[PDB]
Write a protein that binds this ligand. Structure first.
Ligand SMILES: Nc1nc2c(c(=O)[nH]1)N[C@H]1C(S)=C(S)[C@@H](COP(=O)(O)OP(=O)(O)OC[C@H]3O[C@@H](n4cnc5c(=O)[nH]c(N)nc54)[C@H](O)[C@@H]3O)O[C@H]1N2
Ligand SMILES: Nc1nc2c(c(=O)[nH]1)N[C@H]1C(S)=C(S)[C@@H](COP(=O)(O)OP(=O)(O)OC[C@H]3O[C@@H](n4cnc5c(=O)[nH]c(N)nc54)[C@H](O)[C@@H]3O)O[C@H]1N2
Ligand code: SF4
Ligand code: SF4
Ligand code: SF4
Ligand code: SF4
Ligand code: SF4
Ligand code: SF4
Ligand SMILES: [K+]
Ligand SMILES: [Mg+2]
Ligand SMILES: [Mg+2]
Ligand SMILES: [Mg+2]
Ligand SMILES: [S]
Ligand SMILES: [W+6]
Ligand SMILES: [Zn+2]
Ligand SMILES: [Zn+2]
Lengths: 126, 80, 50, 429, 269, 569, 50
């Protein structure tokens, strides 16, 4: 399903980054995708099911979660972090600032696993 | 037996409730002005360790102002 | 606007919706059912119904 | 258990200076007044890595070294680079930031802070059209219309509303009840839940919406009967609310700096605020993110004349956001070395930038384990500002508040590390 | 007189070479040209470190024709502030090609980075490929932008082309992204392809013509009607155009936007 | 160390020296009787020796200055510099801090004062000072729109206001009581202003006149070295000369009582050019500078500085919030603003003073009238309200204008709009300043009025070794016909000593020591002081956005503190 | 037009301590008769009864 990806802060992601990016707390709070209940029905997923997110700029796997902050129709929300930054638009339009918000992506269910923090960074072949 | 009741696991520690409370405001000019108390004062609740923490519930008049100032239902008036 | 009692009949009957009234719920601090009335003379066609 | 009162919180740009720290045995074990985020930074969470000592990677596994050796390796990298990038700065104090500028001159580096992924667009906007602001106390004591445009303070500046909206002020003694609260956001945020008016506009259409508001303000009819998903009549009503304010404040954040148009969204927000002053007193404040992102832009500006994306490659300072920004040098593959201090670009830059950080030497002045330290070749743990070290920080509207040293640490401070690093870079030339 | 610069392998750390212009080459032998200063990161280097040099010299800039016989995708500021002569680049260029030039002609047979013709005062720039952002723009903070000259992009360009324009002419034969003519005060912009959004945003004056489709426009423009077969600054465009005046978010604004009737019916109120 | 400056023509007006061949002897930072003959000799033969220049009014450190720096990258691009041994910098009209210090020294200035410091933002001013080389300095806290000041004076409580000032001066490490548009900037907190000195701001119900007179009493009860520093109401308005004359009279019956120094005047009025306008609108606008000059001549309670228009593209930055908005509304250029809680306001707008334009042409003439029609140079200081009327790097051009009526006539008969002749008298004035009178208005008058003439503004024994040598031979050079030689020789000093150390040689900076921060230490009755400090902290808890404990400037920000004593118990 | 007539059950007095009131608006919301309200200042810098 083609949706609009919005990204940004949550109080839980804020608590997680100041505790430690290495903790499971961070994966549970930033490796997620908030969706409206009705969008989860049309796609056949429930809370806890994992989602494959593909864009023109990359791909990532995140855990689906009902949004306590309701979204407009067609929009999803992934909190700021390395998982969200797999798929958002990098180009800055000659301002230095990447397009972190409102990016067309494809979302589909997946039995694949969510990568933890050290493992996700391996995709960049350091 | 309606009284104040916190849900610290939902709370952002944002302080809206502490400031809005007329009892807290009457007792602390700092609170009245949107600040956390620095002077030692006895008020209904504060944010402690990052979450709302009821300290002197006997002073609560169950008016519901704090409840209406919280968007995440982390503080409520109900049966205890 | 002093004589006006804000009954709202002109506003309903204007055939071109040229009259607007700023309605409100009264309060002890503002004990009136409206704060203003205006005629948009760009819309008014001077039929005299009001 | 010593109680330390009047502590300045080192997280967000609200820069609360009323924190009370619970100190049990040279350790911070709890707080008062701090929000859930602020409390998290003051207190160590069990299991989380706090780097005790410097590190250097050899075979994908790090090896502990001394400060001198790690600083020597780092100074070697910077001194032989031809386009080195020194990025971050926003979560450390201003003296460390000032050494950084002198180091950037010495190394011929590009020095840039987190503004270039945050309110840099606001910086570009204000350079073109201006910057009409006030300090928090003015909002508290005068404001009767408060607007959060494209920000979610409940989640990103948690005590901001309690300190500025629910707070009772001299001419606003009824607190929340004396203020009209407006939130503009495509989502029903927890901030929008508290608002009197929620403009739930279409995403990426703020610029269009503000064009209609500005044109309506100057007496012009709105061409379209719906703009940004907002009906024409509702736009005119919103503009009337702003015109009737006795004192209006426009807070704004990433919803319009990151979204389509970027700096031009802020541009047009600023010009509306300016022109509102013919009808009502109006100002704006950008919701600066980190507790001292504003401080780096202050320091850099007054030392070099420019606020961020500053290139010293030619000796003279030169400035071109879109070229000399951190993401520009990485995505165009210009930079051959990256020094990261008090920031986590590994977590918070896009993949195209991360692709370049994997190809170049990366130095990280970082106390914790992050995605950046995973991409790093040297790690240098510092003392944490506002907990273990002091120095100036700047609140989001420019108020300088001195961070405080609550506990002692065997670790070096940012300022110390950079001062030694600077000395070694001079040498290697 | 033709002087050939043949690029060696371009470095990952870009070059800045504003001294590549007839004004500097004039009066100099082939060997002196090789010793010309360019920047390589935080290092000053010689032009001959990255270019072979040949041809015949000349005393006057009008008479020099610089040919860059290769791709210099990572060379910035070619032809900056040149006043006479000609530069032909048989390949791509990086940023600031022709920035601030007062005369002469520059031809880029490939693509150009952002700020092509920034602060142009006069002369011609012709880009046969695509361009980036800020074709013919101003510099940050300065409300006085391009004041003369002509720029032509045969391919596509991106954002904010013509930013703060105050004279001259920009022609994009392809498409542009958003905000062409932002803060435009004067001059003429022709886009023969499409615009995504925000044409004329906050313009105070000048003229913008879109021959393709504007996907979105702006509520601050007043609709003036239709004109057929119009001619702006010596440029004639047949067919009918919708005519708009704005941007009336700006005080006293006199800008004009023309949009071909064929592809913009949805834009009319 | 030891130094001796030989055979230079000395100009020191505080010690009656008018171009006398004379050697100056320096040791360990002071000017001394003599020295051993192993002293390093500086041949000033055929050259002019003056004291180090003392700028009483410049905008060089703090929040409003840095906004102008930040939001004008194009000003930086116009003028970016980097010389070996120095820090990088940029900014034509709003230079960066290192550049600021370098450029003051090059033209022979060793001391300059930051003119408008918001108290809550004091840490910012001092931090920029630390990155400002060579010059000694001080900052003026703003009082004329302060809520405590207005509340206390309206209560009739001058004593409590004096104790508040004592605390604020110490807490911000400030030096003078600066007054900018009294009451009007508070009125700008609601988008308004005041008009005249009898028009109060909302709620506070106290007139500008009461603020001026109340604050002039405070100043002398605290025995401060400087007087009140007044920027009058109605700046830049046709017909404001009447407001300005009434403002000057308000405190003239108060007697000056400085505890340190030789100040004998109770009112310092800054950039008076902007306050000398006749007419009623811009169309009947005329110069009233002769009436202002006449008042200055006939009265002995006032010192002024001019605020000369340099006729450049520059940046305006003042604590006069509403005036700056009005300026933006006139020229349309980018406008910055900052209302500071309980304390003050500010605003920043670029401005172009073209010589071809009528009003800037008259404004240029008004400043020239003030310089030349005020007989006694002991009452005037050379300024440009830097950068409001022009950057301080233009002071050598102002000097050249004053020493040469040929330079002036060149401008008047060429570029200058004809309104300079039609609406002013500048063209009928052929007076030319002398090297002594130039020395008076660039060093001596300011040093004395600031209370620093014991150590600054003079070359006599006992002063600090702040010395400038200019490559001008007064026996050879004609200042009237060779005005360009004057301007250039005053722009690039042959040699400059800062506390006995050479810091400039032939216009070039060769050393960058940090300068001193002068501030005012005063003592007040413990009982009053305690009562005020209890009320202040109580108000911080209620209305400030910061906790009282965090407000005062910590000593870390004054590495080189230089306290100056006022009243003592 | 003085067409409505009302009589009340109780007689009494209302007394408000403005300095104790912290303007939480509870009583305003509670009052079933719309007696109590928060006046808005007419002019900037003007203060009202709390
Ligand atoms: N918890 C937490 N708090 C933090 C941080 C953190 O990492 N975590 N970091 C700090 C930093 S660095 C910063 S910069 C601040 C940022 O604080 P905010 O500025 O609040 O940043 P975001 O939450 O990313 O985005 C705010 C809102 O923009 C909205 N938005 C998205 N697209 C659009 C649009 O097109 N129009 C409009 N009007 N709105 C849109 C989103 O729905 C979102 O709710 O937070 C700071 N505080
Ligand atoms: N998808 C998406 N991506 C985004 C955003 C978004 O909205 N969406 N927002 C962007 C924005 S606005 C920003 S600013 C960035 C976030 O910017 P970052 O700077 O990456 O945010 P943090 O993760 O808080 O990084 C601060 C780091 O400094 C460390 N630190 C804390 N105190 C100190 C100290 O005293 N000294 C030193 N040396 N280090 C210290 C912390 O442990 C932490 O790892 O994210 C950006 N990326
Ligand atoms: S309770 Fe609701 S309101 Fe009081 S703090 Fe926790 S969140 Fe903020
Ligand atoms: S209920 Fe009314 S009183 Fe009890 S706490 Fe919440 S607010 Fe203070
Ligand atoms: S005017 Fe219209 S509203 Fe007022 S009274 Fe007559 S009719 Fe009713
Ligand atoms: S005259 Fe006819 S039209 Fe004009 S207002 Fe009255 S009613 Fe409406
Ligand atoms: S708001 Fe920002 S600053 Fe104040 S506590 Fe919460 S986190 Fe720390
Ligand atoms: S408002 Fe009504 S209720 Fe709330 S405090 Fe004042 S009086 Fe008590
Ligand atoms: K922690
Ligand atoms: Mg510009
Ligand atoms: Mg600058
Ligand atoms: Mg103020
Ligand atoms: S940030
Ligand atoms: W940020
Ligand atoms: Zn002034
Ligand atoms: Zn001034």
């Amino acid at each position: 399903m083609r949706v609009i990806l919005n990204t940004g802060r949550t109080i839980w992601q804020g608590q997680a980054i100041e505790s430690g990016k290495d903790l499971k707390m961070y994966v549970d709070a930033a490796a997620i995708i908030q969706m409206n209940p009705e969008m989860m029905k049309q796609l056949g997923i429930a809370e806890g099911d994992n989602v494959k997110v593909i864009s023109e700029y990359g791909d990532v796997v995140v855990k689906a979660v009902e949004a306590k902050e309701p979204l407009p129709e067609g929009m999803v929300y992934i909190p700021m972090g390395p998982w969200a930054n797999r798929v958002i638009r990098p180009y800055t339009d000659s301002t230095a600032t990447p397009s972190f918000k409102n990016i067309p992506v494809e979302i589909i269910p997946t039995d694949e696993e969510v990568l933890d923090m050290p493992t996700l960074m391996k995709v960049y072949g350091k | 037996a309606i009284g104040l009741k916190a849900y610290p696991e939902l709370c952002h520690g944002c302080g809206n409730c502490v400031i809005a409370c007329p009892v807290n405001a009457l007792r602390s000019p700092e609170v009245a002005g949107g600040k956390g108390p620095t002077d030692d004062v006895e008020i209904i609740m504060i944010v402690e360790d990052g979450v709302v923490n009821i300290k002197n519930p006997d002073l609560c008049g169950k008016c519901g102002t704090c409840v209406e100032s919280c968007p995440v239902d982390a503080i409520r008036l109900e049966e205890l | 606007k002093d004589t006006c009692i804000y009954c709202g009949m002109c506003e309903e009957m204007c055939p071109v919706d040229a009259i607007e009234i700023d309605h409100q719920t009264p309060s002890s601090a503002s004990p009136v059912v409206a704060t203003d009335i205006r005629v948009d003379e760009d819309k008014c066609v001077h039929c005299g119904i009001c | 258990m010593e109680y330390v009162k009047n502590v300045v919180c080192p997280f967000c740009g609200t820069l609360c200076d009323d924190i009370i720290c619970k100190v049990e045995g040279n350790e911070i074990v709890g707080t008062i007044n701090a929000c859930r985020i602020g409390h998290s930074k003051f207190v160590h969470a069990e299991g989380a890595m706090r780097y005790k000592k410097p590190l250097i990677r050899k075979n994908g596994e790090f090896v502990e070294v001394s400060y001198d050796e790690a600083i020597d390796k780092a100074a070697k990298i910077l001194a032989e680079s031809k386009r080195p990038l020194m990025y971050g700065w926003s979560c450390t104090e201003c003296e460390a930031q000032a050494v950084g500028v002198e180091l950037a001159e010495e190394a011929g580096a590009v020095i840039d802070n987190t503004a270039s992924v945050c309110h840099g667009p606001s910086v570009l906007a204000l350079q073109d059209v201006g910057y009409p602001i006030c300090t928090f106390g003015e909002v508290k004591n005068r404001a009767d219309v408060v607007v959060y445009w494209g920000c979610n303070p409940m989640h990103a500046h948690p005590r901001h509303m309690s300190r500025n909206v629910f707070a009772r002020g001299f001419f606003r003694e009824r607190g929340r009840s004396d203020r009209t609260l407006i939130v503009v956001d495509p989502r029903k945020t927890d901030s929008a839940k508290l608002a009197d008016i929620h403009l739930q506009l279409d995403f990426d259409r703020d610029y269009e919406l503000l064009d209609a508001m500005r044109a309506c303000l100057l007496g012009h009819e709105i061409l379209y009967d719906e703009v940004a998903g907002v009906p024409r009549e509702q736009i005119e009503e919103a503009v009337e609310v702003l015109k009737n304010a006795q004192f209006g404040i426009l807070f704004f954040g990433m919803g319009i700096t990151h979204s389509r148009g970027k700096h031009r969204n802020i541009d047009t927000a600023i010009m509306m605020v300016q022109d509102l002053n013919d009808y009502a007193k109006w100002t704006l404040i950008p919701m600066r993110g980190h507790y001292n992102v504003t401080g780096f832009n202050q320091v850099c500006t007054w030392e070099s004349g420019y606020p961020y994306c500053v290139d010293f490659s030619g000796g003279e300072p030169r400035y071109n956001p879109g070229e000399t920004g951190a993401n520009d040098l990485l995505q165009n593959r210009e930079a051959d070395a990256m020094m990261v201090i008090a920031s986590d670009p590994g977590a918070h830059f896009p993949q195209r930038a991360l692709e370049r950080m994997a190809e170049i030497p990366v130095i990280a002045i970082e106390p914790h384990r992050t995605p950046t330290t995973e991409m790093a070749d040297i790690i240098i743990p510092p003392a944490i500002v506002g907990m273990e070290a002091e120095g100036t920080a700047y609140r989001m509207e420019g108020v300088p508040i001195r961070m405080k040293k609550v506990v002692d640490s065997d670790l070096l401070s940012d300022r110390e590390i950079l001062e030694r690093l600077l000395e070694k870079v001079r040498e290697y030339k | 007189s033709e002087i050939i610069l043949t690029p060696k392998e371009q470095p990952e750390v870009p070059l800045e070479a504003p001294n590549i212009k007839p004004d500097v080459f004039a009066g100099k032998s082939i060997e002196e040209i090789k010793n010309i200063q360019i920047m390589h990161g935080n290092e000053v280097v010689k032009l001959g470190d990255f270019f072979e040099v040949s041809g015949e010299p000349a005393d006057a800039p009008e008479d020099i024709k610089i040919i860059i016989d290769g791709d210099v995708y990572n060379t910035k500021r070619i032809g900056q502030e040149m006043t006479a002569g000609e530069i032909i680049v048989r390949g791509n260029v990086n940023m600031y090609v022709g920035a601030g030039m007062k005369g002469g002609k520059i031809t880029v047979e490939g693509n150009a980075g952002s700020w092509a013709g920034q602060d142009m005062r006069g002369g011609e720039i012709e880009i046969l490929g695509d361009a980036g952002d800020y074709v013919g723009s101003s510099y940050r903070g300065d409300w006085r932008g391009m004041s003369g000259g002509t720029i032509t992009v045969h391919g596509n360009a991106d954002n904010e082309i013509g930013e703060y324009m105050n004279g001259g002419k920009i022609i994009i034969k392809g498409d542009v992204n958003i905000m062409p003519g932002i803060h435009m005060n004067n001059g003429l912009i022709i886009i023969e392809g499409n615009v995504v959004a925000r044409a004329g945003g906050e313009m105070a004056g000048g003229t913008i013509v879109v021959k393709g489709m504007m996907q979105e426009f702006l509520a601050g423009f007043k609709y003036l009607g239709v004109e057929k077969d119009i001619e702006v600054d010596g440029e004639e465009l047949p067919g009918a155009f919708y005519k708009f005046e704005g941007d009336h978010a700006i005080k006293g604004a006199k800008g004009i936007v023309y949009a071909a009737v064929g592809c913009n019916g949805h834009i009319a109120p | 160390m030891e130094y001796i400056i030989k055979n230079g023509f000395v100009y020191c007006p505080l010690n009656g020296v008018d171009g006398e061949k004379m050697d100056i002897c320096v040791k360990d930072g002071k000017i001394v009787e003599s020295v051993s003959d192993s002293a390093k000799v500086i041949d000033a033969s055929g050259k002019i020796v003056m004291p180090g220049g003392v700028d009483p009014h410049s905008h060089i450190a703090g929040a409003k200055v840095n906004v102008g720096r930040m939001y004008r990258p194009e000003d930086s691009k116009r003028d970016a510099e980097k010389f070996k041994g120095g820090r990088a910098g940029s900014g034509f009209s709003v230079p960066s801090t290192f550049m600021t210090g370098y450029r003051y020294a090059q033209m022979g200035y060793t001391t300059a004062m930051e003119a408008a410091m918001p108290p809550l933002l004091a840490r910012h001013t001092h931090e920029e000072f630390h990155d400002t080389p060579i010059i000694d300095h001080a900052a003026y806290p703003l009082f004329g729109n302060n809520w405590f000041v207005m509340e206390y004076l309206k209560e009739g409580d001058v004593d409590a206001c004096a104790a508040y000032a004592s605390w604020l001066l110490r807490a911000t490490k400030g030096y003078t009581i600066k007054i900018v548009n009294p009451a009007g900037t508070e009125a700008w907190g609601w988008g308004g202003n005041v008009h005249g000195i009898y028009d109060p701001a909302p709620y506070f119900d106290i007139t500008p006149a009461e603020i001026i007179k109340g604050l002039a009493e405070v100043n002398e009860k605290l025995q401060l070295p400087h007087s009140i520093h007044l920027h009058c109401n109605d700046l830049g308005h046709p017909g404001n000369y009447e407001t300005t004359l009434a403002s000057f009279d308000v405190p003239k019956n108060i007697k000056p009582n400085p505890a340190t120094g030789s100040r004998d005047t109770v009112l310092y009025a800054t950039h008076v050019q902007f306050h000398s306008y006749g007419g009623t609108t811009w169309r009947d606008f005329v110069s009233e500078a002769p009436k202002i000059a006449d008042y200055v001549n006939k009265n002995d309670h006032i010192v002024i500085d001019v605020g000369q228009i340099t006729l450049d593209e520059t940046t305006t930055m003042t604590a006069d919030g509403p005036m700056e908005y009005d300026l933006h509304s006139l020229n349309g250029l980018k406008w910055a603003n900052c209302d500071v809680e309980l304390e003050t306001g500010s605003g920043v707008v670029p401005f172009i003073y073209s010589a071809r334009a009528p009003v800037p042409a008259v404004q240029w003439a008004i400043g020239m009238e003030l310089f030349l029609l005020i007989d006694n140079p002991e009452k005037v200081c050379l300024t440009t309200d830097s950068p409001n009327a022009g950057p301080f790097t233009r002071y050598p051009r102002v000097i050249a204008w004053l020493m040469s009526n040929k330079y002036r006539m060149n401008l008047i008969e060429g570029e200058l709009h004809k309104w300079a002749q039609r609406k002013s008298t500048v063209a009928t004035i052929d007076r030319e300043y002398t090297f002594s009178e130039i020395a008076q208005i660039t060093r001596a008058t300011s040093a004395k009025v600031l209370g620093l003439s014991d150590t600054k503004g003079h070359l006599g024994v006992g002063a600090d070794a702040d010395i400038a040598v200019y490559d001008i031979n007064p026996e050879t050079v004609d200042p009237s016909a060779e005005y360009m030689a004057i301007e250039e020789a005053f722009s690039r000093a042959a040699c400059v000593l800062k506390d006995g150390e050479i810091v400039v040689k032939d216009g070039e900076v060769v050393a960058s020591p940090h300068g001193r921060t002068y501030w005012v230490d005063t003592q007040v009755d413990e009982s009053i002081y305690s009562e005020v400090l209890a009320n202040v902290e109580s108000k911080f808890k209620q209305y400030y956005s910061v906790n009282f404990a965090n407000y005062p400037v910590q000593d870390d920000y004054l590495p080189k503190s230089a306290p100056v004593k006022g009243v003592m118990l | 037009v003085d067409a409505a007539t009302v009589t009340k059950p109780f007689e009494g007095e209302l007394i408000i301590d403005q300095d104790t009131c912290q303007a939480c608006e509870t009583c305003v919301m509670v009052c079933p008769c719309n007696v109590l309200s928060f006046p808005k200042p007419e002019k900037p810098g003007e203060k009202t009864t709390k």
